[PDB]
Amino acid sequence: STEEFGKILLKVNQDGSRVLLRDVAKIELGGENYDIIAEFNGQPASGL
């Protein structure tokens, strides 16, 4: 889950506070590659 990746502990500061991955990055499910996008009769679509 994105929630599990978000709370990955990058480091703990000297004052006790801790830097999670969600503090330095946005966590979402997204394509391996965003180059390829298809439309069927001008309507958002995928295909094989």
Binding site: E3, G6, K7, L20, R22
Partner: protein
């Protein structure tokens, strides 16, 4: 080998066979290799109808395995709301700490079972309760980034 058949029946969810083995007088606190009673297995796999039958024939509700985990730990961890109530109503230790200092609230908070967390708190579940790492059920909610859970524990 009668209390051993009860363990297998309790896990399988065979409501009838448990009552049949109970009539013949099988050990209700018959523990397996890892120290799980029939009540443990029923709580984990979520056989509420069996949990009621076991507790009615005096199944040790505060029975703990070889790592100090009780049926309430399992019930609260795997989101078995009905079983958590039935356990607590039959005098289950809500502040029960395992070998790691983890309580049913810690497990309920971790998996984000918001309903069960409220039921534990209702029966006097210690919110300030820490584990071996000095982490409360609220420290879990902030790290998990749970909005709904964090508001309940403050």
């Amino acid at each position: 080998d009668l209390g051993k058949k009860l363990l297998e029946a309790a896990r399988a969810g065979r409501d009838d066979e448990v009552r049949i083995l109970m009539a013949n007088g099988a050990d209700v606190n018959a523990a397996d290799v890892v120290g799980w009673t029939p009540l443990h297995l029923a709580a984990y796999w979520g056989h509420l109808e069996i949990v009621e039958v076991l507790l009615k024939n005096g199944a040790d509700v505060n029975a703990y395995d070889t790592l100090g985990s009780t049926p309430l730990h399992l019930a609260a961890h795997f989101g078995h709301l009905e079983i958590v109530e039935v356990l607590l109503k039959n005098g289950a230790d809500v502040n029960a700490k395992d070998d790691n200092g983890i309580t049913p609230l810690h497990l309920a908070a971790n998996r984000g079972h918001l309903e069960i967390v409220e039921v534990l708190l209702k029966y006097g579940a210690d919110v300030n309760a820490q584990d071996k790492f000095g982490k409360t059920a609220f420290d879990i909610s902030i790290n998990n980034g749970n909005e709904d859970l964090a508001e309940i524990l403050q």
